[PDB]
Amino acid sequence: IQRTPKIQVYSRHPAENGKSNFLNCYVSGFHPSDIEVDLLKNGERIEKVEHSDLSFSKDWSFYLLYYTEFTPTEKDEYACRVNHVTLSQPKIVKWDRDM
Amino acid sequence: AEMYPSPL
Amino acid sequence: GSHSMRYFHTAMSRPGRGEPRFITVGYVDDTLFVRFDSDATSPRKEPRAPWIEQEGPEYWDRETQISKTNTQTYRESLRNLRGYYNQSEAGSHTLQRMYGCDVGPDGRLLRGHNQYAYDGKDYIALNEDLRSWTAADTAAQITQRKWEAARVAEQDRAYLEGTCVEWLRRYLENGKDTLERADPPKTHVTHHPISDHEATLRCWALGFYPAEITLTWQRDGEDQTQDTELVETRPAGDRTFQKWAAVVVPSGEEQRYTCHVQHEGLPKPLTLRW
């Protein structure tokens, strides 16, 4: 009777090391609407994170975009960590610039 | 503009 | 092209944690232009697109009052629904509504909508005729009976054919530089070895508006529906959207594959290859 979130992690603009950009975590397809989302840099929670206004799709499921400014590098690892009533443990999705 | 009560 | 205006209402009960939260957002096509949240410090309808800012104080007052009244109405609806389903006072529940109008390039009504869901399940909907209802179950039949007795559909029809269409036309005019502009996808194909004998070809579409798009892969001119991996179209955060489609291809066979892109902003549909 509930729906677990889909999660995509990606950049606003094509990633180029050393160039400022936005890191996005798009959560969608979930129900009910309460959800917790963190963006992580090298495993640690990023503080400045903003989100879009909670919205829903034609199938009634909810969606949100979380985003923060970032400057990608070769070494730094980014991820999105999501919790929802449907998840027993938080789900972590890594940023892969190829996806 | 929104539509201008009828609860369910 | 064609356009839509849609309002989205959500009410969420939270027993032991206050009264149910009520939110509203409004969209023209894929552009959110207004929001309301009963949990806000000072709940008011707020602009979220520059072209709506020019509406005067009377507009904002009316819009805010509608949302404040809705907060109370939806709390009553949630109480009624809990009873209709013999549910305990302890659980949290969600009521959603979407309503609005679709118009063609000439601004004429294509159709109207007024739908509700309870706990994510379709509950009651106004039929396309804008005169009758479809109820999902015996609970919704109670709502249907009340709304038929009160001739609610007639109010919906008047709004959908009148106010809705007229205000959408006004917004499209005020926001013409964005709302009436389709931005085509920027496209490219990338190649990702999986092993010595196969690689992924991924066809990218970036920077497009509106969100509607068709991406497909063909092999030897044959659609690869089952073998194509699609991601959900996703927002970039600058109004535009992104999508990709991928296939796994045998090494050396890449030239047999073509990616096809259709979007409102393209002067012509694109065919791309690695």
Output the DSSP codes for chain C. --EEEEEEEEEE--TTS-SPEEEEEEEETTEEEEEEETTSSS---EE-SGGGTTS-HHHHHHHHHHHHHHHHHHHHHHHHHHHHTT--TTS--EEEEEEEEEE-TT--EEEEEEEEEETTEEEEEE-TTSS-EEESSHHHHHHHHHHHHTTHHHHHHHHIIIIIHHHHHHHHHHTHHHHT-PBPPEEEEEEEESSSSEEEEEEEEEEEBSS--EEEEEETTEE-TTT-EEPPPEE-SSS-EEEEEEEEEETT-GGGEEEEEE-TT-SS-EEE--
Structural domain range at position A39: 1-99
Which residue in the set B2, B3, B7 is minimally distant from C73, CB to CB? B7
Q: Does C23 touch chain A (CB under 8 A)?
A: yes
Q: Which of residues 111-130 of C touch A (CB under 8 A)?
A: 117, 119-122
Experimental approach was X-ray
Domain boundaries, chain C: 1-181, 182-272
Would you tell me which CATH number, out of the four given (3.30.500.10, 3.40.50.720, 2.60.40.10, 3.30.110.40), belongs to the domain C1-181?
3.30.500.10
Resolution in A: 1.3
Q: Is C260 within 8 Å of chain A by CB? A: no
Considering only CB atoms, C190 lies closest to which of A3, A26, A98, namely A98
Determine whether the interchain pair C94/A33 forms a contact, defined as Cβ–Cβ distance below 8 Å: yes
Whichever domain contains A36, its CATH number is 2.60.40.10
Q: Which two tokens stand for residue C134?
A: 């479809």
Cβ atoms of residues A87 and A40 within 8 Å: no
Q: How many domains does chain A have?
A: 1
Contacts of B6 in chain C (CB under 8 A): 73, 146-147, 150, 152
Contact C237 A6 (CB under 8 A): no
Give me the CATH code for the C182-272 domain, please.
2.60.40.10
SS3 assignment for C35-91: EEECCCCCCCCEECCHHHCCCCHHHHHHHHHHHHHHHHHHHHHHHHHHHHCCCCCCC
Beta carbons of B1 and C76 less than 8 Å apart:
no
